[PDB]
Amino acid sequence: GAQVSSQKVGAHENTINYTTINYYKDSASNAASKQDYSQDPSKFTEPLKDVLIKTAPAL
Amino acid sequence: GLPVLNTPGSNQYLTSDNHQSPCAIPEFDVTPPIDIPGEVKNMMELAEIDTMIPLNLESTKRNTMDMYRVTLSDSADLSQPILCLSLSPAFDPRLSHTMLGEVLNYYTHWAGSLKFTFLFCGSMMATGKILVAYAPPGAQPPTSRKEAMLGTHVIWDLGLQSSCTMVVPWISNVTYRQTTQDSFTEGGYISMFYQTRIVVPLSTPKSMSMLGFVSACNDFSVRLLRDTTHISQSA
Amino acid sequence: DSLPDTKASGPAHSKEVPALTAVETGATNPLAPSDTVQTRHVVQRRSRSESTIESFFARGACVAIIEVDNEQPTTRAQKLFAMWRITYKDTVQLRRKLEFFTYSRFDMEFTFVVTANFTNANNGHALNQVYQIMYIPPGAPTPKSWDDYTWQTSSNPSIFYTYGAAPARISVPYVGLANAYSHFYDGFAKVPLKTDANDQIGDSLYSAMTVDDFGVLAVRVVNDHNPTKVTSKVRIYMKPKHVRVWCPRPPRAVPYYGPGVDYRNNLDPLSEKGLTTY
Amino acid sequence: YSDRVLQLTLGNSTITTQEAANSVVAYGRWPEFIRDDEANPVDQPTEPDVATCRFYTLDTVMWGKESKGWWWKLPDALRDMGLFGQNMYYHYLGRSGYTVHVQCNASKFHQGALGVFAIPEYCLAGDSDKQRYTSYANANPGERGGKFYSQFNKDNAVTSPKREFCPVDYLLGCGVLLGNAFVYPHQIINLRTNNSATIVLPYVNALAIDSMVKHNNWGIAILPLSPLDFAQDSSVEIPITVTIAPMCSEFNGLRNVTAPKF
Amino acid sequence: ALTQPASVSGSPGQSITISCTGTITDIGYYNYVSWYQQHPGKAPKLIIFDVTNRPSGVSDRFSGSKSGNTASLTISGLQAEDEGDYYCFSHRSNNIRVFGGGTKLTVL
Amino acid sequence: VQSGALKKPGASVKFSCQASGFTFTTYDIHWVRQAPGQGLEWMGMISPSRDSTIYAQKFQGRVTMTSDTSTSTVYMELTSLRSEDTALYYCATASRPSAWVFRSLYTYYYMDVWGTGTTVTVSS
Ligand SMILES: CCCCCCCCCCCCCCCC(=O)O
């Protein structure tokens, strides 16, 4: 029941995979996957009701 | 059973490893999550929020609310700058305590472009123009507008739209600039000058305030995490 | 997972003005460097991977130093066992990192580092020591001595750590009553009422939802008392995992004063720098 | 059809402004009722709609030249505001969003700027050395609100230590610098730009529903970022009016009335 | 100072509870609640150090408890040598320490 | 513990408390007073390990405390006295350790070692 995923190779010799197996039943025991994706900061940086494009005047 | 050979680094504690560990409370019924507003997935969403700069920081005005407002007047000498900033956003004593610099003080390396925003808080009858300039390093800091206009600069007209954004482009000799005061990876100088001047009519306040703002762009990234010097604990 | 690439931008002479905006609207002007100056096409190979919440919180942080002693009875009093109420608020760094956000929900991974030393120069001889770290949940009985019945740990979770081994390490799931941990609680546990007999019935601390929120940990030596005093310290290291956070806050700027948001001592967090001095 | 002209209508009340900036919806989330997959209590909730979701106007505060700032806590500012205050006091659990409208009109010859900040879990620092000793009567001022102070005056009375707050204005009353408070949902009333600010606050808590009497979820702080100046006189003072409407109000557990000792 | 009753009386063989009521913080927050005994002319002697815990040499007839803002000292099987003063001790916030008012116990 | 073993009105009175060297350097030293029939009253704390002193709020102005590592003695000076200060003054050593961890980094201490004290009368 192994899980394979790709490393992001920062330094090369001259894809590379890594294997993880969860050995315990509880999910708090698990490793941090660290494969989380980013999100749009528009809910903090443009929280307007009438959203306007940047080329338009802001009033 | 299976023959094993212990490698170096056995029985250590790294404080940064992702290793699995047994659960002290097994079969726990975790409370299910709810959709709370305002979820943050990345710390760069916080740095892209535009926050004020303590620009003044003179001896009688620091650690009061007068630090955030920069005075402008019709009687001001047009030959001398309004304010000056060194672009070292985690070290420079104005930019360090902004939320950009507060995220930056948890990191050593930074890269990306910056937005500088200014807000005019004068009367509606007051109008004028303002030159804000970015000088890349390796030269004398700008002491007059004649030196400052040769760099990257925006001329701001004080009209109905009360705010303008200066974008500082990512010009560097390195892929990531250091957050300490490294002279090799210095970021440059930001200066602001009067172009024309503030004109007011009669029965109008002759002096007025301006607020400065700073935030990161969408091409902003940091890597190596570290401690911060802004907090301390006594014995 | 790379950043968006910089687009090429030529000269502009147009009615569209992306430079002017209004911060009074509450929005931040979402400008790129192509909107103000001329830019070349640059392909970005930089990522925000270590600026994620998990990477920001995947470090160990010390939260307690629990001191236990092992000596035979004398005229001078002895500390044969110690108890620590579980909180992060007594060390400034992890508290400051957690207080960037109002609500958090994470799994939790403790680590215990135990060091021992002598205090008498005359003998210096003692055997290996075994340390018991028992979790006492709220309302469960607390030990009155190092040898009473509560140490039988029939229901309570317990770690038996022998000295010299690799540091003890367990995982705790999300244990909080709410759907997120509340770093800040703008309220009271009790409301004083007009029908109360006196004010102390309804009196309560501000910004304190519950006293004994997560329970206490008890540390003792299971060995009998050596003839010379051996003083041990158990250092407890917190590391949040699977961290989700909500509602960002400004960080703390003045020195902390107790578990609340109170400030007392410095209040001068910025230095002196002239307006026209670079 | 510009965003400067805005009309907000809720219940039997309507607010029209001709010089708004825009409307900020906090964290991109409009207020909503509890859906079935998040409902923790089992009793049927009371949703009065029009009887509670209407604009309520607090006391007008006077913005003098030397004034330092004002603060309010929700839903405590609506504790006497009609059927919302009655439904808050007759029930154990309550959930509501809010629409906060701040009105500050001045002429074209006036100058100054206010920062209207919306702070979730707005804890405030105490006045004395005894930590977290602030009483419920002082921490909940109601529609009167509180004021910021320019310095920490350490209260040191031997008897009756007053158990108040002492919110330092550049520290926002909670030890964070005022310039970093823009990560909260916010709008700026700049007198040359706009005369009104509108923030729409969704219900933000770690629980799906909570006790409104015990707990304040949102705090509103108004601080002069630029001071108020007029033509060559020192006695200038203009009024500031704060108007709050509850939104998607629901109340679950009925009981006899709460009478707090203020 | 923390509130205590001024005087309690009882015959030998009785069980007598002396109560120490403080405030929020104080007894209610901290578990550093302690009790002392003082015979006339003598130095104070510690009889209970933590809330329910007895020092070595203190007889088992002393006992203690906490119920909130109130801590109680219970003496079961009163003897004539228990006559004297009893002082409550607790830790207040911002690191100051404050004694109780004291209770004179008379063995009738 | 040697408590130094005084009467005048108004003028300042000095006190002494000498202890053994291990208890002087290792443990904190506290001062308690007791007026006749009026109960115990805390005065302050001297910590000779780091020379840090904390004073009670009733006594924050009038009372000054010093340390002396050469004779392992602490001194307290009441800089001005009034007629209410007619009391028996005790010196106590914080020797009994608590199970509960103070904050999260320290160990709390109560007193179980008490000096015999001294009686001071403030009247003409
Ligand atoms: C064998 C030892 C088991 C340890 C059990 C630990 C009990 C739970 C600790 C959870 C800490 C939560 C920290 C954040 C809480 C908050 O901010 O309110």
CATH of the domain at E95: 2.60.40.10
Cα separation, B210 vs C211, whole angstroms:
47
- A44/B21 CB distance under 8 A: no
Whether residues B205 and D225 touch (CB distance < 8 A) is answered with: no
**CA distance linking residue D171 with residue D151, whole number of Å:** 10
Interface size between D and F, measured as CB pairs under 8 A: 3
Query: Which structure tokens are listed for C118?
Result: 């002598």
Which residue(s) pair with F13 in the sheet? F78
Residue C252 CA to residue C176 CA, distance in Å, equals 24
The residue whose C-alpha atom lies closest to atom 14 belonging to ligand 1 is C181
Query: Do the Cβ atoms of D182 and C28 come closer than 8 Å?
Result: no
Burial classification of residue E10, based on how many CB atoms lie within 10 Å of its CB (0-12 exposed, 13-18 middle, 19 or more buried): middle
Number of structural domains (chain D) is: 1
Every domain of chain C and the residues it spans: 23-248
Residues of C with CB below 8 A from A57's CB?
A: 17, 20
Q: CATH no. for residue D37?
A: 2.60.120.20
Q: Domain C23-248 - what CATH class?
A: mainly beta
Q: Which of E34, E96, E99 sits opposite F110 (nearest CB)?
A: E34
Instruction: Tell me which chain E residues have a C-beta less than 8 angstroms from the C-beta of D131.
Output: 25, 93-94
Q: Where are the domains of chain B?
A: 1-235
Cβ contacts from A onto D, under 8 A? 30
Q: How far is CA E72 from CA A13, E1, E8, E9, E26, in A?
A: 74, 16, 13, 16, 14
Nearest to B220 by CA among B93, B50, B72: B50
> Domain limits at A49?
1-59
The closest alpha carbon to C77, from F25, F93, E35, belongs to F93
Q: Where are the domains of chain F?
A: 13-120
Q: Which residue of C has its CA nearest to B10?
A: C166
Of D219, B98, B21, nearest in space to A22 by CA: B21
- Edge-to-edge, what's the strand order for the sheet holding D218-229? D146-147, D70-74, D218-229, D111-120, D186-190
d(CA B91, CA B97): 9
Q: Name every residue whose Cβ is closer than 8 Å to that of residue A13 and which is 6 or more positions away in sequence.
A: none
- CA-wise closest residue to C127 among C114, C118, C139, C140: C118
C178 lines ligand 1 (CB under 6 A): no
Report how far apart the first and last C-alpha atoms of chain C are (Å, whole number).
Answer: 37
Cβ(C73)–Cβ(C234) below 8 Å? no
Helices (H) and strands (E) in chain F, counts: 1, 11
Give which of C110, D173, C85, C263 is closest to B231, Cα–Cα. Answer: C263
Asked whether the beta carbons of B56 and B67 are under 8 A apart, the reply is yes
Q: Which residues of F54-90 are buried (b: 16+ CB within 10 A; e: fewer)?
A: bbbeebeeebbbebeeeebbbbbebeebeeebbbebb
Using an 8 Å CB-CB cutoff, list chain B residues near A58.
161, 163
What is the distance between the alpha carbons of residues C185 and C63, in angstroms, rounded to a whole number? 21
User: Are residues C64 and F100, on separate chains, in Cβ contact within 8 Å?
Assistant: no
Residue found under tokens 């002096």: B207
- β-strand partners of F7: F121
Hey, what CATH class is F13-120 in? mainly beta
Residues ≥6 apart with Cβ < 8 Å to E35: E20, E46, E47, E48, E62, E64, E73, E86, E87, E88, E89
Q: How far does residue C106's CA lie from ligand 1's centre (Å)?
A: 10
Would you say residue E2 lies in a domain?
A: no
Beta partners for residue D225, in sequence order = none
Calculate how far, in angstroms, residue C263's C-alpha sits from the geometric centre of ligand 1. Answer: 25
What are the helix (H) ranges across C150-205?
Answer: 199-202
- State the Cα–Cα distance between residues E29 and F102, nearest whole angstrom: 13
Neighbours of B219 (CB within 10 A): 19
Take residue C243 and report the two structure tokens written for it.
């961290």
Range of the structural domain that residue D51 is part of:
6-254
Helices and strands (DSSP H and E) totals, chain A: 1, 2
> Two tokens at F110?
């109560």
Residue E1 lies in a domain: no
Cβ-contact D149, D168 below 8 angstroms: yes
Helix (H, G, I), strand (E, B) or coil at D134: coil
Contacts of C82 (CB under 8 A, 6+ apart): C66, C67, C68, C218, C219, C220, F99, F100, F101, F107
Confirm or reject: Cβ of C86 under 6 Å from ligand 1.
yes
Among C174, C38, C155, CA closest to C103 = C174
A2 Cβ partners below 8 Å, 6+ apart?
A19, A20, A21
E26 lies in some domain: yes
- Our CA-based measurement puts residue D258 at a distance from the nearest CA of chain A, in whole angstroms, of 37
Determination approach: cryo-EM
Give the C-alpha distances (Å, rounded to integers) separating A9 from A12, A15, A18, A37.
7, 8, 11, 18
Chain E CA closest to residue F107: E32
Contacts of C102 in chain D (CB under 8 A): 120-121, 204
* Contact predicate C257/C263, CB 8 Å: yes
Contacts of range E1-4, beta carbons closer than 8 Å, 24 or more positions apart? E1/E98, E1/E99, E1/E100, E1/E101, E1/F39, E1/F41, E2/E26, E2/E27, E2/E88, E2/E90, E2/E98, E2/E99, E2/E100, E2/E101, E3/E100, E3/E101, E4/E86, E4/E88, E4/E100, E4/E101, E4/E102, E4/E103
Nearest chain A residue to C1 by CA distance is A37
Written out in words, the top-level CATH class of the domain with range B1-235 is mainly beta
Number of domains making up chain E? 1
Distance, CA of D61 to CA of F52 (rounded, Å): 47
C175 lines ligand 1 (CB under 6 A): yes
Residue C192, both tokens: 């004083």
Q: DSSP letter at C258?
A: S
Cα dihedral value C204, C206, C210, C215, nearest 10: -110
Tell me whether E25 touches chain C (CB under 8 Å). yes
The Cα–Cα gap between B56 and B211 comes to: 10
- How many CA atoms, within 13 angstroms, populate the side-chain half-sphere of residue C137? 9
Contact C64, C237 (CB under 8 A): no
- Which tokens belong to D182? 């823009």
Best of B48, B53, B123 to disrupt the D interface (most D CBs within 10 Å) is B123
Pocket test for ligand 1, best of C91, C100, C108, C238 (most atoms within 8 A of CB): C108
Query: Is E in contact with D (3 or more beta carbon pairs below 8 Å)?
Result: yes
Q: Which residues pair with B73 in a beta bridge?
A: B207
* Spatial distance between the Cα atoms of C241 and A30, rounded to a whole number of angstroms: 9
Q: What is the resolution of this structure in A?
A: 2.9
Are B213 and B99 in contact by the 8 Å Cβ rule? The answer is no
